Design a protein around this ligand. Structure first.
Ligand SMILES: O=c1[nH]c(=O)c2ncn([C@@H]3O[C@H](CO)[C@@H](O)[C@H]3O)c2[nH]1
Ligand SMILES: [Zn+2]
Ligand SMILES: [Zn+2]
Lengths: 157, 157
């Protein structure tokens, strides 16, 4: 089922960058095969630099479930969560994170080299509680190609 | 000027605890001596674990200035911002952060050992360039006293 929800997050990234809500980033929060929230980056729509896909999904899932913790839930991110979003994932008590593309795939088309030390295990103070799965194979390929596809779409604009 | 806005952030922390909005944390965003946002933790009121004082303040300042970057603004946090909030401060491009109490003051009364490497200078993948001032003297005194005064008066999260 990992493939299904990761590809749904990828679809959310495409949808969000097509409708102009924000950058090509998606996030899906699931509760035992049940989709709780399916969101993308809403920074431009909300005029909110904290409205990344992961943060938006956390907010919507927490409001839908009437609780500030998502201990029974897992999050699927189309792209490797940033430091802010990884911190939000920690605070949300999500029990597992699956992300598709490395941050370098986003950096390749002009996004900031804003990478979470706690996700990559390079910190002194911050460590991760979280089970972190980096996607491989076909899901990883789809997620990685997201960014070059979006650049192609808007090339002649 | 630093002491005034840090004191206002401390006051926001106290007000938020008294309201039941969240924990004893405040944040004030300033543009050239004008207060752009004055917020406290809203986790309990919004059912939103991302609604820390700093994130709430960034949201409100961005909505008031109707822009997603706060390049000429400064932020005053009653307590050392967590990894999430420091990532949000990074993304909002705030040029200066003044914080009152070290994170250990909050950790000592039950909060997560959840510390931002990039703030303390131990980040590797997260490279922050904003100016960071840790309060001294009376500011540090009142900011630390926040956590002694608010013990047992709010629900942890
Ligand atoms: O930056 C923060 N803003 C808050 O509102 C807040 N509320 C609680 N905490 C927790 O306090 C500790 C010290 O930063 C960390 O465990 C935070 O998650 C907060 N950190
Ligand atoms: Zn993010
Ligand atoms: Zn925080």
């Amino acid at each position: 089922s990992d493939h299904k929800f990761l590809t749904q997050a990828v679809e959310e990234a495409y949808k969000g960058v097509d409708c102009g809500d924000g950058g090509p980033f998606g996030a899906v929060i699931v509760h035992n095969n049940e989709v709780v929230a399916s969101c993308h980056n809403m920074v431009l729509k909300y005029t909110d630099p904290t409205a990344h896909a992961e943060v938006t999904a956390i907010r919507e899932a927490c409001k839908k479930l009437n609780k500030i913790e998502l201990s029974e839930c897992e999050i699927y991110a189309s792209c490797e969560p940033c430091p802010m979003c990884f911190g939000a994932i920690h605070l949300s008590r999500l029990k597992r994170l699956v992300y598709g593309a490395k941050a370098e795939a986003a950096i390749a088309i002009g996004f900031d080299d804003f990478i979470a030390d706690a996700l990559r295990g390079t910190g002194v103070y911050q460590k991760s509680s979280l089970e972190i799965k980096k996607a491989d194979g076909n899901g990883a390929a789809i997620a990685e190609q997201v960014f070059q596809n979006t650049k192609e779409k808007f090339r002649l604009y």
